[PDB]
């Protein structure tokens, strides 16, 4: 596997490390999404310590309105983060 | 940096390794896109050896119709690849 291929599988690896914790094992609920951002995005995103912030993140990511973040929705989130880091370095 | 953070920056790293070769340094032209897929996606995508295949890939990725693949368009491509690998493992 190339670096890019490793990065692709890392995205799947990490999503499932969090989505697999509780309930639907293929989607992130609020607490799973919260721990993902807090543990895995600490250098890009501000630590989440408030419920209103958890709710707002979920609302923003949850395109289909089912209260959880699926893999497609997680990818859109990765894209918004990756693009912000990209433009940071212009 | 966490694994997920490393994967985010890998996506930016690799795009620029190819986009920086010729012309517009912030976009992938056909030959750059071709070498990216051929060198960096050899385990996920079939090697590209025909011009009609290069053209078709570019056409599919090039959402804004300017003949090149920018970072946003490259991200949509990463998402389609990552999701295919995700569903492969259901
Ligand atoms: Ca879950
Ligand atoms: Ca959802
Ligand atoms: Ca270029
Ligand atoms: Ca374009």
Of all residues in chain B, what percent are helix, strand and coil, respectively (each to 5)?
65, 0, 35
CA trace torsion B63, B69, B72, B77 (10° rounding):
80
Query: How far is A66 from A71, CA to CA, in rounded Å?
Result: 13
Burial of A36 from C-beta contacts in 10 A (0-12 / 13-18 / 19+): buried
Query: How far is B54 from A88, CA to CA, in rounded Å?
Result: 30
Q: In this structure, what token pair is assigned to residue B55?
A: 């053209």
Query: How far is B15 from B8, CA to CA, in rounded Å?
Result: 11
Contact A34, A54 (CB under 8 A): yes
Domains of chain B are 1-90 (1.10.238.10)
Query: How far is B89 from A45, CA to CA, in rounded Å?
Result: 29
What is the CA(B30)–ligand 3 centre distance, in A?
Answer: 9
Kindly report the three-state secondary structure assignment for every residue of chain A: CCHHHHHHHHHHHHHHHHHCCCCCCCCECHHHHHHHHHHHCCCCCCCCCCHHHHHHHHHHHCCCCCCCECHHHHHHHHHHHHHHHHHHCC
Burial of B83 from C-beta contacts in 10 A (0-12 / 13-18 / 19+): middle
Best of A6, A7, A75 to mutate (most B CBs within 10 Å, chain B): A7
Resolution in A: 2.0
Query: How far is A42 from B4, CA to CA, in rounded Å?
Result: 10
Instruction: Show residues of chain A in contact with B71, CB under 8 Å.
Output: 83, 86
What is the CA(A19)–ligand 2 centre distance, in A?
Answer: 12
**In B, residues 9-48, which contact A (CB 8 Å cutoff)?**
9-15, 36, 39-44
Expt. technique: X-ray
HSE, CB side, 13 Å, CA atoms: give it for residue A83: 15
Helix axes A71-88, A51-61, angle to 10 degrees: 100
Looking up tokens 């920056």 gives B9
Judged by its nearest atom, the ligand closest to the C-alpha of residue B66 is: 4
State whether B83 and A72 contact (CB < 8 Å).
yes
What is the CA(A60)–ligand 3 centre distance, in A?
Answer: 33
DSSP B47: P
State whether A39 and B78 contact (CB < 8 Å).
no
Q: In this structure, what token pair is assigned to residue B36?
A: 């990216």
Query: How far is A82 from B10, CA to CA, in rounded Å?
Result: 10
């Amino acid at each position: 596997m190339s670096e890019l291929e490793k990065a692709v599988v890392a995205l799947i690896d990490v999503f499932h490390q969090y989505s697999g914790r509780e309930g639907d094992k293929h989607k992130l609920k609020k607490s799973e999404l919260k721990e993902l951002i807090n543990n895995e995005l600490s250098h890009f995103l501000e630590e989440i310590k408030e419920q209103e912030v958890v709710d707002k993140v979920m609302e923003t990511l949850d395109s289909n309105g089912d209260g959880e973040c699926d893999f497609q929705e997680f990818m859109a989130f990765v894209a918004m983060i990756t693009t912000a880091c990209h433009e940071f370095f212009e």
